[PDB]
């Protein structure tokens, strides 16, 4: 007769790392600068700046991969477009799952899920300038140590390879 279901959203997600400051924000503004993508704890919202309304919601519960992955892991970054390859985004979570989703449309039930290889490392941040990608990750006085790898996607193996650059 009765049934239980989640309805609303929740607090916005943050880069809950004491060491990093000035990078606590993980939301991004589209390349065309017409909509803002904000990750929550339980969903990802896309708001249209011009109209100030929520044009799209990508709920973790609905999709299978997102439900398994996030429902603890959190989005450590969002990159506009897709690295492997016009409304695509790539979500990097702390454990290492890299998920290619689409806003402005209907979410596809099989996103191009991948997994970076990390050995006892918690991914902290990722970033790029021009087709070049570097990932910063934490390994372990109560002070964590950091490592900087170089990330590239190889088409033949369709895998993310990490090469050590700095410590």
């Amino acid at each position: 007769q009765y049934k239980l279901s989640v309805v609303s959203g929740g607090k916005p997600a943050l880069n809950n790392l004491s060491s990093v400051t000035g990078n606590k924000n993980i939301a991004r503004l589209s390349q065309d600068q017409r909509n803002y993508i904000i990750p929550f704890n339980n969903q990802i919202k896309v708001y249209s700046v011009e109209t100030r309304q929520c044009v799209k919601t990508l709920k973790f519960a609905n999709n299978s991969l997102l439900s398994g992955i996030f429902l603890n892991e959190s989005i450590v970054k969002i990159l506009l477009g897709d690295i492997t390859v016009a409304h695509l985004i790539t979500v990097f979570t702390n454990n290492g799952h890299v998920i290619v989703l689409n806003y402005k449309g209907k979410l596809v039930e099989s996103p191009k899920h991948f997994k970076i290889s990390l050995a006892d490392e918690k991914l902290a941040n990722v970033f790029h300038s021009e087709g070049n990608y570097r990932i910063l990750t934490t390994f372990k006085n109560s002070l964590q140590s950091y490592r900087l790898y170089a990330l590239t996607f190889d088409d033949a193996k369709k895998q993310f390879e990490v090469a050590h650059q700095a410590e």
Binding site: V7, S8, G9, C54, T57
Partner: protein, 128 residues
């Protein structure tokens, strides 16, 4: 959905899953200045209870104002009760009456119960 935030009420629409409003329902240093160092120890009034009449036009609030520290009057909490009203189209509640120290001095208003529809056509309440 009405959230009694400290010194304020946040009105949130869960059908649309957004906030609609954020109104300060107390006096106190709320947004007049940014508290820093010792001023940060001040405690703004706290909305303990908030309730609506059945008809839905009247808003009852109960607030506790905390005196500052290190004064003679630093142990006499002030209990305030307020009645607000608004039309459906409007989005800001307007304060209509204010009772200072109901039931006596320093005696809390633990409970508020708006009246049923029969008595005064839902324009009443009980305080305990």
């Amino acid at each position: 959905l009405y959230f009694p935030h400290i010194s304020a009420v946040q009105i949130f629409d869960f059908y649309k899953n957004e906030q609609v409003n954020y109104q300060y329902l107390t006096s106190g240093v709320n947004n007049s200045m940014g508290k820093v160092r010792f001023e940060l120890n001040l405690q703004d009034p706290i909305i303990t209870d908030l309730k609506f009449t059945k008809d839905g036009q009247w808003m009852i609030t109960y607030e506790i104002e905390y005196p500052p520290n290190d004064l003679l009057s630093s142990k006499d909490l002030t209990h305030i009760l307020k009645f607000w009203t608004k039309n459906d189209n409007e989005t800001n509640w307007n304060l209509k009456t204010k009772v200072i120290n109901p039931h006596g001095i320093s005696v809390p208003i633990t409970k508020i119960l708006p009246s049923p529809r029969s008595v005064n056509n839902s324009q009443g309440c009980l305080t305990a």
